[PDB]
């Protein structure tokens, strides 16, 4: 649920086991998928992907470069 207006969004969490980093009631930076508003490839009705969890990037957390605070 976005902060700046309050709309609900389904947002795809990218790499495998990256869902485990994201916990309920956490700050999440969401971005577009790539196609400006199309559901990209396989996933139906999902336009957005998670980029950061609690101000650290998923790309770092997967690669084991940083720790996630809570």
């Amino acid at each position: 649920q976005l902060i700046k207006n309050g709309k609900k969004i389904t947002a795809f969490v990218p790499n495998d086991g990256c869902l485990n980093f994201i916990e309920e009631n956490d700050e999440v930076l969401v971005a577009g998928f790539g196609r400006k508003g199309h559901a990209v490839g396989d996933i139906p009705g999902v336009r957005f992907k998670v980029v950061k969890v609690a101000n650290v990037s998923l790309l770092a957390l997967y690669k084991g470069k940083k720790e996630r605070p809570r």
């Binding site: 495998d16 086991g17 990256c18 869902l19 485990n20």
Partner: protein, 55 residues
């Protein structure tokens, strides 16, 4: 019903990276890219082999 999260990441054996000598960088690397392609040319009848081609 089903749905593991990151099954294949935790099942794969954690293989340690081998220690190789450092690669040359910049002009030095480009020099080596030039000499590997245009200088020591080995004759072939039709050329069907690639640069990375493993078997």
């Amino acid at each position: 019903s089903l749905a593991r999260a990151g099954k294949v990441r935790g099942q794969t054996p954690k293989v340690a990276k081998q220690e190789k000598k450092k690669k040359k960088t910049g002009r030095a690397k480009r020099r080596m890219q030039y000499n590997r392609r245009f200088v020591n040319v080995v004759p072939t009848f039709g050329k069907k082999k690639g640069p990375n081609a493993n078997s």
